[PDB]
């Protein structure tokens, strides 16, 4: 089974665990390049009743994001404001999360892809580049970073 975080049947708690960032994505591509803030390798996802504790590295950072008021929806600080939900999970293999920033009065969206394991399927990246261009996010702006 698929679901989305926003779904009648999603089952946050298939989400606890080990999660790699494979690929990132944004309509600001300085944002997730090489010095950008927003290039950061997921390590685990920790469930808990009313938020996510996202453990990363890019040195070891921390993040708890809240649930908001609407179902699905996180919020989290970190280099301004983020909202975000996950708009296609298998649980299993992949992960697949819509953010978006407001910082200084400006926006941006990010997009990500997490696996189970280091890296993922052909096919499973191809599913993640028709997403992003549904958001409008251009292919030459998504990295892969499974390779870094």
Same mark, same amino acid.
């Given at each position: ?18 999660? %790699?960032?494979? #690929? ?11 010095? =950008?803030?927003?290039?950061?390798? +997921?390590?685990?996802?920790?469930? +808990? ?7 990363? %590295?890019?040195?070891? +950072?921390?993040?708890?994001? !809240?649930?908001?008021?609407? &179902? ?7 280099? =301004?404001?983020?909202?975000?939900? #996950?708009?296609?999970?298998?649980? !299993?293999?992949?992960?697949? &999360? %819509? ?13 990500? +892809?997490? =696996? ?12 993640? &580049?028709?997403?992003?261009?549904? %958001? ?7 990295? !892969?970073?499974?390779? &870094?």
């Amino acid at each position: 089974e698929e679901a989305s975080s926003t779904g009648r049947n999603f089952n946050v708690e298939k989400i606890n665990g080990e999660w %790699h960032t494979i #690929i990132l994505a944004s309509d600001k591509r300085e944002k997730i390049e090489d010095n =950008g803030n927003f290039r950061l390798f +997921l390590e685990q996802i920790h469930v +808990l009743e009313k938020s996510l504790v996202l453990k990363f %590295h890019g040195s070891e +950072l921390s993040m708890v994001a !809240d649930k908001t008021e609407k &179902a699905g929806e996180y919020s989290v600080t970190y280099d =301004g404001f983020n909202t975000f939900t #996950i708009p296609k999970t298998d649980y !299993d293999n992949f992960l697949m &999360a %819509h953010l978006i920033n407001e910082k200084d009065g400006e926006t941006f969206q990010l997009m990500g +892809l997490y =696996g189970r394991e280091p890296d993922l399927s052909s096919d499973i990246k191809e599913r993640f &580049a028709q997403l992003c261009e549904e %958001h409008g996010i251009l292919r030459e702006n998504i990295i !892969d970073l499974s390779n &870094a």
